UniProtKB/Swiss-Prot annotation, chains A, B:
PTM summary: Probably methylated on other residues.
EC number: 2.1.1.85
Reactions performed catalytically: L-histidyl-[protein] + S-adenosyl-L-methionine = N(tele)-methyl-L-histidyl-[protein] + S-adenosyl-L-homocysteine + H(+)
Primary gene name: METTL18
Family: Belongs to the methyltransferase superfamily. METTL18 family.
EC category: transferase
Result when mutating residue 130 to A: Loss of protein-L-histidine N-tele-methyltransferase activity
Key word Nucleotide-binding present: no
Source organism: Homo sapiens (Human)
Region span, Disordered: 1-35
GO cellular component annotations of the record: cytosol; nucleolus; nucleus; protein-containing complex
Whole-protein residues included: 69 to 370 of 372
Protein name (Swiss-Prot/TrEMBL): Histidine protein methyltransferase 1 homolog
Length: 270, 270
């Protein structure tokens, strides 16, 4: 079997992440879960490798890698980070996106670099959501912790309470998170990278924006133009939003290399 | 045991790469080896993940990753790439370093991104050297191949003969490579990243430059200011070069973040 290249979707056989994404004719109808921050913070990072993310078109970010032997050869392993994440990171710095004091959601966070940027940026509350439970425990939580002062700009260890972590399908996450405060406060910003690859979940995603976004807030969404096979894309999604007539969209940036990538802004009409 | 951070040297216990680097009181006195390009090119990449290197302060480069399960959770694994590699990549683009027609050596190549840049840049001959045999077979060779047109700017498959691959200690590599042509042609460029961390091998490295560098060529060396424990660094190395009085050095760029990093040019006096 051929190697996965950039142009394989999150659901292709070749993709490392296939089994961390909802798929099939009857996926989990399990409820969503909030994940607590472990008591022992140093233990989440034991034996890991903390690596600076290279490139100067973003803030200083760290990523946690795991040493994994194969035929006694040491690999540094991490969860795949999709291209559009870096586009959105670059766009935060270039467009001087303001994070201080905001309530922020990283929807479909994977490694959590978007939320972590907001965290380091002075956001009051940062929520992270991934579909997969293990992604949150094994990757997201450790990554956030590694971007605190624990070891060692970086927020002190005592600010970690500002971050909260959720797993499950968007419908479930929505119901759960709406019940998690005496009176729910909407997000000022929802940041999301590569979450419109699958048209089967556009209904759920739209409904999530409708229930969770503040009146005056916005979604910053990064996406490839099209995803082959699974069949989602930017045009298709804008059509979907346009038909429902609740939000407006606006293309903030095109990244032009080979197949195009987009950063898109979604706000309420209004 | 605490996680390895940027400020651990290549020989620290925490470092993933410790056993791929020469160390101890009696390392291998084995001869160096040239490694042939395998016959079956597609098979070198089977089941791998080909990932674009993010950041736009370098040319488009691809990196081969391996899917490695742990508790049934899929990691994308790769050999560690040291920070200074990216500094030197940025410096190639910023300073418009000219590669076309040159004979180039990537000394201590690891993943081989420096040599690959030269390859994509039109160099006539590109030699890759790592200490470790497995590094070359498992990482370097596949990385070069992944940056050819095989799958599918990128050089066609038919240009791969221009790349040659070597493993072993620098003294041995030198003797070997000097015997590998009816009349050896010196390198116009030697590119090297993080190879002066260990003062025990400064003699060997200097001798390698002396025997292998063209009269009118140059070494472009990227290094951290200092490496703790093992104890090498930029000042210490410039002293060493200065004492032997064969080469001159010149600092081309400082990258100023926390502890400093340098790009250094070495030429003959003449
Ligand atoms: C391809 S990944 C991108 C991950 C990360 N944002 C990045 O760019 O590297 C897709 C993300 O969307 C999430 N996701 C996809 N469909 C979902 C759904 N129906 N409900 C909840 N989360 C979903 C996945 O868990 C994952 O975080
Ligand atoms: C820390 S790594 C850097 C690898 C790669 N250049 C990078 O920046 O990611 C050190 C490199 O120097 C090589 N090396 C170190 N000492 C050596 C020696 N005495 N002889 C030959 N190679 C050596 C290693 O094999 C490796 O390629």
């Amino acid at each position: 079997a051929a190697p996965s290249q950039d142009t394989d979707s999150p659901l292709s056989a070749a993709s490392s992440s296939r089994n961390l994404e909802p798929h099939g004719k009857q996926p989990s109808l399990r409820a969503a879960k909030e994940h607590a921050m472990p008591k022992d913070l140093k233990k989440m990072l034991e034996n890991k490798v903390i690596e600076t993310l290279p490139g100067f078109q973003h803030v200083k970010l760290s990523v946690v890698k795991t040493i994994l032997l194969k035929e006694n050869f040491p690999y540094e392993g991490g969860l795949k980070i999709w291209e559009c994440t870096f586009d959105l990171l670059a766009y935060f710095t270039k467009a001087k996106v303001k994070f201080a004091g905001k309530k922020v959601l990283d929807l479909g966070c994977g490694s959590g670099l978007l939320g972590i940027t907001a965290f380091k940026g002075g956001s009051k509350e940062i929520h992270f959501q991934d579909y997969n439970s293990m992604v949150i425990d094994e990757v997201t939580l450790p990554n956030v912790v590694a971007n605190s002062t624990l070891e060692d700009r970086k927020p002190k260890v005592t600010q970690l309470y500002k971050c909260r972590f959720f797993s499950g399908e968007w419908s479930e996450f929505c119901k759960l998170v709406l019940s998690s405060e005496k009176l729910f406060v909407k997000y000022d910003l929802i940041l999301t990278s590569e979450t419109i690859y699958n048209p089967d979940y556009y209904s759920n995603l739209h409904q999530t924006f409708l229930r969770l976004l503040s009146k005056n807030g916005r979604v910053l969404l990064a996406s490839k133009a099209h995803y082959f096979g699974v069949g989602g894309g930017v045009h298709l999604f804008q059509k979907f939003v346009e038909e429902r007539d609740v939000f407006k969209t606006r293309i903030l940036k095109i990244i032009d290399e080979g197949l195009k990538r987009f950063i898109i802004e979604i706000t309420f009409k209004f």
